[PDB]
Amino acid sequence: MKGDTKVINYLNKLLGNELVAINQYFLHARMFKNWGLKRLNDVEYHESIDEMKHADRYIERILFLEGLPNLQDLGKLNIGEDVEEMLRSDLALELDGAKNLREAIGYADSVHDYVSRDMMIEILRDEEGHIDWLETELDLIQKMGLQNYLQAQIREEG
Amino acid sequence: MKGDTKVINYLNKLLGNELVAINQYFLHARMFKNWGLKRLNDVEYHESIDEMKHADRYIERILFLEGLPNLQDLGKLNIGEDVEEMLRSDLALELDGAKNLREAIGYADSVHDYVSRDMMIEILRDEEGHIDWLETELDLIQKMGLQNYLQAQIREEG
Amino acid sequence: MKGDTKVINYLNKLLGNELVAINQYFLHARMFKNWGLKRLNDVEYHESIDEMKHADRYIERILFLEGLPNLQDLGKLNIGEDVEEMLRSDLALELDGAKNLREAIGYADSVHDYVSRDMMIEILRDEEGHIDWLETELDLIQKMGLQNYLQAQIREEG
Amino acid sequence: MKGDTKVINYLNKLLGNELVAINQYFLHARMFKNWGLKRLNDVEYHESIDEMKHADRYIERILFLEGLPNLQDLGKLNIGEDVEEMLRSDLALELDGAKNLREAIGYADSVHDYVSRDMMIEILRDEEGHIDWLETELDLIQKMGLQNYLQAQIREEG
Amino acid sequence: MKGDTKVINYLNKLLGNELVAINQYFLHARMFKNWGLKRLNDVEYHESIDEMKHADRYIERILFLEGLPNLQDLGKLNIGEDVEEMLRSDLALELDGAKNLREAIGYADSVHDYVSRDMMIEILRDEEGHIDWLETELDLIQKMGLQNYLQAQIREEG
Amino acid sequence: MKGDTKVINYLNKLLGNELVAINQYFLHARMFKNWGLKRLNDVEYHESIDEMKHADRYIERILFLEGLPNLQDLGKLNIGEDVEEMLRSDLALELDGAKNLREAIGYADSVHDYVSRDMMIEILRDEEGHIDWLETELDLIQKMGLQNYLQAQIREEG
Amino acid sequence: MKGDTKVINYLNKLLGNELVAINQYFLHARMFKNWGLKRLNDVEYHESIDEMKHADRYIERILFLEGLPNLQDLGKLNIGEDVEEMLRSDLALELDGAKNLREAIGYADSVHDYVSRDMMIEILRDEEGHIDWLETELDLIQKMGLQNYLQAQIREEG
Numbered sequence A, B, C, D, E, F, G: 001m002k003g004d005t006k007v008i009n010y011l012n013k014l015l016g017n018e019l020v021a022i023n024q025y026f027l028h029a030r031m032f033k034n035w036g037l038k039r040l041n042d043v044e045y046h047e048s049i050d051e052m053k054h055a056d057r058y059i060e061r062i063l064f065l066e067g068l069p070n071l072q073d074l075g076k077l078n079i080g081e082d083v084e085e086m087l088r089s090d091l092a093l094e095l096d097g098a099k100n101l102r103e104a105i106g107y108a109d110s111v112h113d114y115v116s117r118d119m120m121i122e123i124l125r126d127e128e129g130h131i132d133w134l135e136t137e138l139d140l141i142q143k144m145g146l147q148n149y150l151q152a153q154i155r156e157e158g
C-alpha cells in the first residue's frame, strides 16, 4: 500500500535512531560483561534486543508502505569510558529518540496513518521504560556510591 | 590481556564486515518476507543472526585483547532490487569477507595469537557455508527458471 | 563349509557389481546434495546403503563357503554430468547387474546351492525395485519437463 | 566456490586412502566375524564406518570446491591370512595415510584453505586414534600370547 | 490335499534326520551342562529347539499332504565322550542332513511342490547356520587350545 | 606411535606447568574456603580441576607418543598471604604458561604434529579464559575496594 | 584454632606422602590405560582420587590448625616399567605411608589432638584397603601367571 512520503521519512529517521541504540547498547553490554559487571551486561544486552525488535518493526512497516528502509547511514555513537558516563550516554540517546518519536506520532495522526501511529506509540512506551531504567540506575549510583553500586552488579539478578 | 595491535585491527575490520552483512541480510530477509517468499525470509533472517553471533565474537575478543571495538563505521551496503541481484550481492559480500578472513588468520598465526586464529577459522567455516547456500540458490534459479524458483519459496520449509 | 568354486566366482563377480554401484550411487547422491536437490540425495544415498547391505551379504557368504572375497578390482564407474545422464547411468548399471544375477541364480540351482540362490533372489528383488525407481524418475522428467522435475527435488519428502 | 587445484588433488588422494581402508577394514571385520572373534569384528567394522565418514567428508568438500571426486581408482589392498598379519597390515596403511594427511595439512595452510585444513586435522585426530588401537592390540598379542588373545575376542565387549 | 508320494517319503526321511538331531543335541546339551560348560549347554539346547521346530514343520506338512508321519524309526545317534568328539559328531550329522535336504529340494521342484520346496529351503538355511556355528567352534578349539576353550564356556554369554 | 623428541619435551614442560598450577590453585582454593570466602574457593577449586584435565591430556598424549611423562619435578609455587597477592600470583603463572604454550604450538606445527598442536590450542583457549577471570577479579578489587570485594565472596554464586 | 606445631608437621609430612601417591598412581593408571589394560587403569585411577581426597583432608586440617600446607616438596616417585614392578612400587609406597601414619596417630593422641587423630585413623583404614588390593593383585599374578593376569585386565569390571 503506497504510504505517505513524509511518514516513510520519519520511519527511516526513527529506524536510524534504533540502529545506533542497537550498537551502542550492545557494545556497552559487552564492556560491562568484560569488567565482570554481569548484571549490567544482562540488562543492557536485553535492551539491545528491544531496539532490534523496534528496528524490525520500522523495516517491515516501511516496506509495507512501499518505501526504502535505509540501513546505510549510522549516527554518532557516544561510547563511554566508565559506567556512569556510559549509562548517561544511553540516557541522552533515549531522550533524543523520544523527542523524534513524539514529533513523528503527531505527524502520522495528521495524515491519518493511524496504524503507523499506533506502532510508534507502542515503541514510545518501551522507550519511556528504557528511560526509567537508566534514570533509576544513575540515581542509585549517587545514592549508594560508586563502589557499592559496582559490587551490586557482579551477580546476575534472578 | 594486551593483544597485538594489528590483530585487533584485523578483528575490527572483520567486525566491520560482519555488521554490513547483518544489515544487508536483514533488509533482504524482510524484503523477501514482504514479497511473500516466506522461505527466503526464514533462511536469510537466520543468516543475519549468524552474522550477529560473529560480531559478538569479535567484540568480546577485541575487548578481551584490550582494544576498542569500532561499530561506528559502516561499509557500503549493496541492496538489490530483485531476488537474483540481491542473492548475488550477498555472495560477493561473503566472498570479500572470506578473503579478509584468510589474510587475518595467517597473520594471527604468525604473531602466535592461536586462539584468535581458532575463533576466526570457526567463523570462516560458517562463511564457507553461507557461500555454499548462495551458490546453490543462484544455480537453482538458472536450472529451474525464475518462475518455478519463486513458487518454491512461497512456503516455509519444515 | 567348502562351497562350489563357480558359485564363489559368481558371488565375487556379483560383489564386484555391488561395489561399483555403492560408489556410483554415493557420488551421485552427494552431487545432487551439492546442487540442492535434497530429495534425490536422500533417495540415492539410501540406495548406496542398500548396495552395501548386498555387498556385506556376498562377503559373509563367500567367506562362509570358504572362498576369498575380492574387493580389489573395481569396474568402470560411469558418472554423469547432469541429473538425467546420471540417473540413466545408474539404470544401465542396475540392468547389467540384474543380468548377472539371473545367470548366477540359475547356476546355483543346478549345483544345489539353494541358500546362495535364496540369498540372490532376495537381492534380485531389491534390484528390481531400484530399477523401478529409476525408470519412474526418468519418465517423470520427460512427462513434467526438466525444470519442474528439478523444482520437485528441492525439498526432502516426508 | 572454486578451490585451489592442488588442494582438490590432495583431497582426492586422501579420499583414495579412505576407500582402500574402508574395504580392507570391512573384509577384515567379516573375516574375524567368520572365525568367531566377535569382538574384533565389532571394532574393525566400526573402523570401516569411521573411514566412510571420512570419505563422505572429502567427497562433499571436493564437490564444494568444484573438483571431481575420484572413486574410480583403488589402491593395493593388503589382506592378511591371520589376525596379526591383518592387524599389522591395517597399521601400515593407517601410518601411510597419516603421512599423506600431514603433507596435505601443511599445504592447505600455505594456500590459506583453512577450512579444508580444519577438516583434515579432525580426520588426522581420528586416524591417530585408529593407530593407537592397532598398536595396543598388537602389543597385547605379544604380552598375553596368541591363544589368550584369541580367547579374549570370542565375546563382544559391552 | 493329496501330495506326491515321493515328496512325503522325503519329508519323512528328513523328519527322521530331525529327530535324531533333536536327541543328540539335547543329550549333548545336558552333558555340557553337567560339566559346567554353561555356554555350550545354552547354545546346544537352543539347537535342539530349532530341530524340534523343523520336525514340527515336516509333521504338519506331511499330514497336510495326507501322508503318515513316521516317528517310530530312529537313526544311529553318535554321542561323543569329550567336547571335540561331540561337536564333531553334530557336524557330520548336520552335513548328512544337508545332503538329504539338497536332494529333496531338487525333487520337490521337479514335481512342482513349490511350497514343500520353499519350506525345505528355509530349513536348509537354518542348517547351514548350525553348520557354520559348529565349524567355528571346532576351529576355535584348535586356535586357542582346549584349556582356554573350556574356560571360555564356563559362563553363559549375555 | 613414535613422536618427535622435542614435542615430547615441550609436552613434559607444559605438563610441568600444569601441575604447579594444580597445587597452587588447590591450596589457594582451600585458603579462601578457610577464610569463609566461599565463592573464591568454588571458582579456584574449579580451576584446579581444569588444570588436572590439562595434565591428564598431556600425560596420555606423551604416553601415546611413546615418551616418559615426568611428574617428578615441581616448579616454584608462589603462594600469597592475602587475596590480591594470591590472585596476582595465579595470573603471573597463567601468563608464563601461556608463553610456553605459544612456543610449543608453533613448534608442533613445524614438525607436522598437528594433533598435539590441536590439543594445545584447545588448552591455550582454556588458559586465556583463566587469565580473563583473574584480570577481571583483580580489577574488581580495585574498582569496588577490598572490603566490598571480600563481602561479595562470602556466598557461593548460583 | 592454633594447633600443636609437631602435629602440623606430621600433617605436612603425611600430605607429602599423599601427593607422591597421587602422581605415581595417576601415571601408573594412564600407563595401564595405554597398554589396554582397561581394568587396572580404572582401579589405579580410583586410587589416585582416593589419595586426592586424603590430601584435601590434610590441607583443610592444617589450615584449620593455622599452619602452612606445603605442596612444594615432592618425594621420589618410583615408576615401574612393567605391571608387576609398578604394582610392587605402589605397595612399598603404601607401606611407608602406613608407617608414618601409625607414628603420627600415636603422637596426636598424646598431645590430645583427638580430631586430627580421628581423621588419620579413617585415612589409615583406607590405606590398609589399598594395601590389601595391591597384595592380592601381586599374588594373583603369581598364582595364574602373567599372561592370564594380563588378559584378565583387558575388560573393565562391571
Ligand code: HEM
Pocket: A019, A022, A023, A026, A049, A052, A053, A055, A056, B019, B022, B023, B026, B049, B052, B053, B055, B056
Ligand atoms: C550490528 C550490531 C548487532 C549485534 C552485535 C547484534 C547481536 C545480536 C545477538 C547476539 C542476538 C542473539 C541471537 C538470538 O539468539 O536470537 C541478536 C538477536 C536479534 N537481532 Fe541483532 N545485533 C545487531 C544488530 C541488529 C540489527 C541491525 C537488526 C535488524 C534491525 C537485528 C535484529 C535482531 C533480531 C530480530 C534478533 C532476535 C531477538 C530474539 O528473538 O531473541 N540485530 N542480535
Ligand code: HEM
Pocket: C019, C022, C023, C026, C049, C052, C053, C055, C056, D019, D022, D023, D026, D049, D052, D053, D055, D056, D059
Ligand atoms: C564398498 C564397500 C562398502 C561396504 C561393504 C560398506 C558397508 C556398509 C554397511 C553394512 C553399512 C551399514 C548401513 C547403515 O546401517 O548405515 C554402511 C554405512 C555407511 N556407508 Fe558404507 N560400505 C562400503 C563403502 C562405502 C563407501 C565407498 C561410502 C562412501 C564414501 C560409504 C558410505 C557410508 C555411509 C555414509 C554410512 C552410514 C554410517 C552410519 O550412519 O551408520 N560406504 N556401510
Ligand code: HEM
Pocket: E019, E022, E023, E026, E049, E052, E053, E055, E056
Ligand atoms: C524327545 C526328546 C525331547 C526333549 C528332551 C525335549 C525337550 C524340550 C523342553 C525342555 C522344552 C521346553 C518347554 C517350553 O518351555 O516350551 C521343549 C520345547 C518344545 N518342544 Fe521339545 N523335546 C524333545 C523332543 C521334541 C519333539 C520330537 C518335538 C516335536 C517335533 C518337540 C517339540 C517342541 C516344541 C514345538 C517346543 C516349544 C519351543 C518354544 O516355544 O520354546 N520336542 N522341548
Ligand code: HEM
Pocket: F019, F022, F023, F026, F049, F052, F053, F055, F056, G019, G022, G023, G026, G049, G052, G053, G055, G056
Ligand atoms: C597433579 C596431578 C593430578 C591429576 C593428573 C589429577 C586428575 C584428576 C582428574 C582427571 C579428576 C576428574 C575431575 C572430576 O570429574 O572431578 C580429578 C578430580 C579431583 N581432584 Fe585431582 N588430580 C591431580 C592432583 C590433585 C591434587 C593435588 C588435589 C588436591 C589435594 C586434587 C583434588 C581433586 C579432587 C578433590 C577431585 C574430585 C573427585 C570427584 O569428586 O570425583 N587432585 N583429579
Ligand SMILES: [Fe+2]
Pocket: A046, A050
Ligand atoms: Fe524490555
Ligand SMILES: [Fe+2]
Pocket: A018, A021, A050, A051, A054, A123, A127
Ligand atoms: Fe527503540
Ligand SMILES: [Fe+2]
Pocket: A021, A051, A094, A126, A127, A130
Ligand atoms: Fe530505547
Ligand SMILES: [Fe+2]
Pocket: B046, B050
Ligand atoms: Fe547457520
Ligand SMILES: [Fe+2]
Pocket: B018, B021, B050, B051, B054, B123, B127
Ligand atoms: Fe560472518
Ligand SMILES: [Fe+2]
Pocket: B021, B051, B094, B126, B127, B130
Ligand atoms: Fe557470512
Ligand SMILES: [Fe+2]
Pocket: C046, C050
Ligand atoms: Fe530400499
Ligand SMILES: [Fe+2]
Pocket: C018, C021, C050, C051, C054, C123, C127
Ligand atoms: Fe545391489
Ligand SMILES: [Fe+2]
Pocket: C021, C051, C094, C126, C127, C130
Ligand atoms: Fe541395485
Ligand SMILES: [Fe+2]
Pocket: D046, D050
Ligand atoms: Fe571411532
Ligand SMILES: [Fe+2]
Pocket: D018, D021, D050, D051, D054, D123, D127
Ligand atoms: Fe580415514
Ligand SMILES: [Fe+2]
Pocket: D021, D051, D094, D126, D127, D130
Ligand atoms: Fe583410519
